[PDB]
Amino acid sequence: LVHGGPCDKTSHPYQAALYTSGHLLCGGVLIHPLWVLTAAHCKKPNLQVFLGKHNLGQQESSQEQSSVVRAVIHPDYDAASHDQDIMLLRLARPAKLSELIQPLPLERDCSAQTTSCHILGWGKTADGDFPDTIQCAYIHLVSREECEHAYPGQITQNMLCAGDEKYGKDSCQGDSGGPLVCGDHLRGLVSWGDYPCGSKERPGVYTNVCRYTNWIQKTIQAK
Numbered sequence: 443l444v445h446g447g448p449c450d451k452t453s454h455p456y457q458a459a460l461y462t463s464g465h466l467l468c469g470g471v472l473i474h475p476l477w478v479l480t481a482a483h484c485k486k487p488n489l490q491v492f493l494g495k496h497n498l499g500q501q502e503s504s505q506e507q508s509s510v511v512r513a514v515i516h517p518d519y520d521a522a523s524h525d526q527d528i529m530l531l532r533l534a535r536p537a538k539l540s541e542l543i544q545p546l547p548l549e550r551d552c553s554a555q556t557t558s559c560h561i562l563g564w565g566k567t568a569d570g571d572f573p574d575t576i577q578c579a580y581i582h583l584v585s586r587e588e589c590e591h592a593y594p595g596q597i598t599q600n601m602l603c604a605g606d607e608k609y610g611k612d613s614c615q616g617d618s619g620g621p622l623v624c625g626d627h628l629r630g631l632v633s634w635g636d637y638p639c640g641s642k643e644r645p646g647v648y649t650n651v652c653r654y655t656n657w658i659q660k661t662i663q664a665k
């Protein structure tokens with residue numbers, strides 16, 4: 443996350459860190475004791491999910507670790523266009539809930555009024571390095587018309603755009619799969635955007651979580 447700052451230790455109990463080959467790959471959101479929601483482009487070998495983390499450089503008494511027993515990619519995910527960029531990860535055992543590990547409720551209403559949002563993650567900061575401490579930034583939802591101009595012909599109804607035209611606050615490499623939180627609900631997932639991150643003209647693109655209510659519930663309830 444670029445042009446942000448450190449989060450407080452108690453504000454992100456739903457945040458997950460996704461590892462592959464010993465390095466941070468993606469963020470994710472705990473949405474149920476057995477399930478983490480992330481971006482479909484985060485599907486990499488032998489994913490390790492970490493819950494209750496704040497500082498990736500230290501061993502924390504609040505942290506829990508799990509391998510993935512089932513990675514469920516949306517059946518209509520299109521890798522070239524990042525359309526329907528959503529994946530459900532079933533954990534090895536139910537997450538042990540605490541003050542620092544809690545699920546985040548999904549925004550089910552696609553007509554939700556709140557445009558005031560926040561993003562978080564351990565992706566690249568303004569200096570180009572990967573932070574040990576999780577970063578936070580307040581950003582806002584950008585109109586469909588504004589985002590369409592930024593990314594001509596690349597925005598579908600399964601995408602939302604959010605950013606900051608004033609200071610360039612934006613998610614970056616390592617943050618994808620991470621949450622876009624508006625009114626204490628999950629509004630989106632970090633999906634893609636421009637390179638370098640933090641343009642004042644091109645906001646970040648997020649998976650529109652409200653479009654996936656039925657699919658998420660049907661996957662979680664599956665036999």
Ligand SMILES: N=C(N)c1ccc([C@@H]2Cc3ccccc3B(O)O2)cc1OCc1cccnc1
Nearest residue numbers: 467468613614615616617618634635636639646
């Ligand atoms: N600016 C954004 N909103 C943005 C946010 C997250 C990510 C990535 C996308 C990604 C791809 C593959 C595996 C993981 C990720 B992820 O964690 O963040 C990329 C982003 O912009 C494109 C980009 C690609 C490459 C370098 N810099 C920037």
